[PDB]
Write a protein that binds this ligand. Structure first.
Ligand SMILES: [Zn+2]
Ligand SMILES: [Zn+2]
Ligand SMILES: [Zn+2]
Ligand SMILES: [Zn+2]
Lengths: 431, 431
């Protein structure tokens, strides 16, 4: 009993946008284990409940005092004296404590920090690093360092510009180590700054929420030649692929059944799903675009399925808002062959146990898994250990810029160093 | 002997701009103690040596493999088996290992991470938090939470814009707790985004290196009414002061003996020190500007002294590039009455022992001390503990935005919580 959970404490802290979020400490005799909860901007309608206070006098309603109170007064007291090694048992307890399908009573943002911190306390009890403990929970046969997918031109709800689509990413798929991947990503990011500055001016080189440049671009095709130029200039021709996150739900109008490609402007630029399909086909032909995330609205299973079939073998189609890391939505996606990659967001579902189940489900059905940050991140590095633990070969955790992004990339350097020179790197289908 | 330093290891990691830097781990039986080294953009000519590789094939010459090698092969082996509690002894050893006045042999960026990590290992050996251990080293009689000075409009070498001067800051001087200070800062930051967007457009709300907005502003007077408007709109009229960092050396031409207020533009806008003096006098009259940092070139002791006398009792004048956290430069500043506040940058001098000596020297001579980040920061939170330890009441560690800034602000929340409701907050002269 001396080896059990001794204390559980929640507190309100700031995320990388200056918005409140929840952090939790679980204390055992082995130490203090701290996990913070991230927060999305383009949040899917099917995501678990992110509970906020709504007090206009604090952070104009974005406080997390209630979620923190739920940790301190409800969840914490239930965990005290419990065996932190029983991840599934304790995750299930918290699910039952909440008692709702969407974690709407206690908050996914109260539950998740507890789930995370328990797993860290457990890894410490076992005497192994977090990634090793999580690999055991997930039954992973082979750890690997992932190819990082760097969102280097920021748009959508993440940036001050006309650009409707959210993420334009570069991935050093031909790197042979994580160390080399990170350096190559950084080097391209640096040549890209100069290219943008020359083309658009110095007012164009400030950064969006995920550390990507936020140039004054309206056209969704316009960033792509710029990415290729940057890759070339940095000396890395042929070593990189491109990943896209359209976050297309954010541009979708349900009543019109069209997508507004200028939703951040005075006018109106309405396009059909069919107009998007041929844009995506042209993208995949003209560039090494190996991944497209949320190409259509989050309930457009037919549109998703169409493009998944059309780019099969060339470009993986990633469910993010479609699937929300939720086994129920994933089962619908599998049945409809709507996509073939899961974007894994721990806070879309709200427990580690459920997020792991989602990963295994997708992998057993032949999908890839790309572990992801949110656009509102913290100094927390949990997803670095998680992606290695799942052995998925794919992470997106920002441009190589801003500490809430670089903290993850740096943790991956530390994990790589621990595993040594025979540690596997990358996503085999892209290598 | 089982209680001594067991292992010392350095590694190259990324800072918040995607540039390589040095991180060091000191291992004892109490755990692994990790410290990372920050890096400036507007670096004073008298700063200690930041050692870089110059290999154009890695990070276009910005690698830190040599500094890391110096940690691993030179400094580390000397520390193994040593009593980590002897901070001054070990800092002095590393000074003698290097053997040069500027740390030019081993690198201040090799030495500093070791100095930091030793102090953390020591605090752990003592069984106290870092801030408590550092307060002992410094002989501090009263801990306090500092007023945070938030650089919310970014210029100079930190931003993509015409704005010649570096930092336009807001400080919630009338807050009565750090928790309240941070919330108020964030709330103003948020109203400021909307104000900038409305005035300049959405292309104007992307961020510079320290998380401040980077609007397309040329005139150094133009951000000030905007700061006042934001303070008002957020509901915090009367609660805030303004702090400036001109970083004026960056605009200075030695041969002309003038300052170029459009150094990031095609033309040429030459002004005299006398033209700056009356700008500063007008600033101090028209706004609650309580601090001006580096108003003149780093060797302009006469200019510094003039404005220090002129704004005595109203506005503190902060040496940063003038003093470079160095007792020798500080003694020159004291003799000339050139300034009355030290900007404390641990990596300007390169050991904790010397940085502490600099703080005490300044405080004994009646100066204030503002502990500072660099514009290239990491997920490291050392300066949060340091500022509390020194009891100085002043920190600048960024806008409430970007994780390399928010990591510090969040650590200050944790320290505040540990100290309780009777913990002192703020800078008394501003309260
Ligand atoms: Zn989203
Ligand atoms: Zn997405
Ligand atoms: Zn500077
Ligand atoms: Zn400065």
């Amino acid at each position: 009993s001396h080896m059990t959970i001794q204390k559980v404490h929640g507190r309100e802290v700031l995320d990388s946008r200056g918005n409140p979020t929840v952090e939790v400490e679980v204390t055992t005799e082995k130490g203090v284990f701290r996990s913070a909860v991230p927060s999305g901007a383009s949040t899917g309608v099917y995501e678990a409940c992110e509970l906020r206070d709504g007090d206009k006098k604090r952070y104009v309603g974005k406080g997390c005092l209630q979620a923190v109170k739920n940790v301190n007064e409800v969840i914490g007291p239930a965990l005290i004296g419990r065996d932190e090694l029983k991840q599934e048992e304790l995750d299930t307890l918290m699910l039952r404590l909440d008692g709702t399908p969407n974690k709407g009573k206690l908050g996914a943002n109260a539950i998740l920090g507890c789930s995370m911190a328990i797993s860290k306390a457990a890894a410490a009890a076992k005497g192994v690093p977090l990634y090793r403990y999580l690999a055991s929970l997930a039954g992973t046969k082979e750890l690997r360092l992932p190819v990082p997918c760097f969102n280097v031109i920021n748009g959508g709800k993440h940036a001050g510009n006309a650009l409707p689509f959210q993420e334009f990413m570069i991935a050093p798929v031909k790197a042979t180590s994580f160390s080399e991947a990170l350096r190559m990503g950084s080097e391209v990011y640096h040549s890209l700054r100069g290219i943008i500055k020359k083309k658009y001016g110095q007012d164009a080189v400030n950064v969006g929420d995920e550390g990507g440049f936020a140039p004054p671009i309206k056209d969704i095709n316009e960033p792509l030649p710029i990415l290729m130029e940057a890759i070339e200039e940095a000396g890395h021709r042929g070593k990189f692929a491109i990943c896209m996150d359209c976050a297309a739900s954010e541009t979708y109008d349900e009543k019109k059944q069209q997508y507004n490609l200028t939703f951040k402007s005075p006018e109106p630029t309405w396009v059909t799903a069919e107009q998007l399909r041929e844009t995506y086909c042209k993208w995949a032909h003209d560039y090494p675009i190996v991944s497209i995330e949320d190409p259509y609205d989050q309930d457009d299973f037919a549109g998703f399925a169409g493009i998944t079939e059309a780019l099969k073998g060339k470009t993986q189609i990633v469910g993010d808002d479609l699937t929300v890391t939720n086994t129920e939505r994933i089962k619908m996606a599998i049945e409809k062959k709507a996509c073939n990659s899961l974007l894994l967001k721990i806070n879309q579902i709200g427990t580690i146990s459920e997020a792991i189940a989602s990963s295994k489900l997708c992998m057993e059905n032949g999908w890839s898994v790309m572990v992801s940050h949110r656009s509102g991140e913290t100094e927390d590095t949990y997803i670095a250990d998680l992606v290695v633990a799942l052995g998925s070969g794919q992470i997106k955790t920002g441009a190589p810029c801003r500490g809430e992004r670089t903290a993850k990339l740096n943790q991956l350097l530390r994990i790589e160093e621990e595993l040594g020179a025979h540690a596997k790197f990358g996503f085999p289908g892209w290598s």
